[PDB]
From a paper:
Segmented negative strand RNA viruses of the arena-, bunya- and orthomyxovirus families uniquely carry out viral mRNA transcription by the cap-snatching mechanism. This involves cleavage of host mRNAs close to their capped 5′ end by an endonuclease (EN) domain located in the N-terminal region of the viral polymerase. The sNSV cap-snatching ENs belong to the PD-D/ExK superfamily of cation dependent nucleases. We find two different kinds of endonucleases, one with the characteristic catalytic histidine (His+) as in orthomyxovirus and bunyavirus, which have efficient endonuclease activity in isolation, and a second, without the histidine (His-) and conserved among arenaviruses which shows very poor activity in vitro.
Using a construct encompassing residues 1–174 from Lassa L protein we obtained three different crystal forms: one with no ions bound (crystal form X1), and two with one or two Mn2+ ions bound in the active site (crystal forms X2 and X3 respectively). The X2 data, solved by molecular replacement using the X1 structure, reached an ultra-high resolution of 1.09 Å, thus providing a highly accurate electron density map of the Lassa EN. In the X2 form, data measured close to the manganese absorption edge, showed a 50σ anomalous peak corresponding to one Mn2+ ion in the active. Compared with the X1 form, the X2 and X3 forms show a 17 degree rotation between the helical bundle lobe (residues 4–49 and 149–167) and residues 50–148, with the hinge being at the base of helix αb. The Lassa X2 structure has the same conformation as X3.
Residue numbers in the entry: 0 to 170
The structure:
Amino acid sequence: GMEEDIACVKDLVSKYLADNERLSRQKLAFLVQTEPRMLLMEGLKLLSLCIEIDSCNANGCEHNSEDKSVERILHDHGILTPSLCFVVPDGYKLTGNVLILLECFVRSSPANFEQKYIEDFKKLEQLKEDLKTVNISLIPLIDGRTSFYNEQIPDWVNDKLRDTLFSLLRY
Ligand SMILES: [Mn+3]
């Protein structure tokens, strides 16, 4: 029944998630949960993290695991500005005065995909003028996906996880 299906998925994630230190904390955050709302929340966060790592790899960006704001990313390179909107990008790369910001997401339906694409696009665009005041050029990348498939977990395990997560919506 449902309990054994959850236990099975936990065992599969334990065995088959990539053995990668960057995933360890979120792997545990999922595995320790008992309540359906928390299995959903942490299971989705695990999948998002996996996709972000892949997206950053594919786009030549650093994954922003320290949750640096754009202001902090600039500060790390000795560039001070107090005037930026608060943005914590999924990934980034700052090389000289060229700032690449990467936003990543998964949405299945066209309406939801479009809503999130617009949201992330506008968020990055709103940095552009203020970045110019400190001589920074912005390359804003949006990796919007419809798929949860990723290099950090086998697709068959991904399917089992998502199916179980779907079933948990009943609670
Ligand atoms: Mn984002």
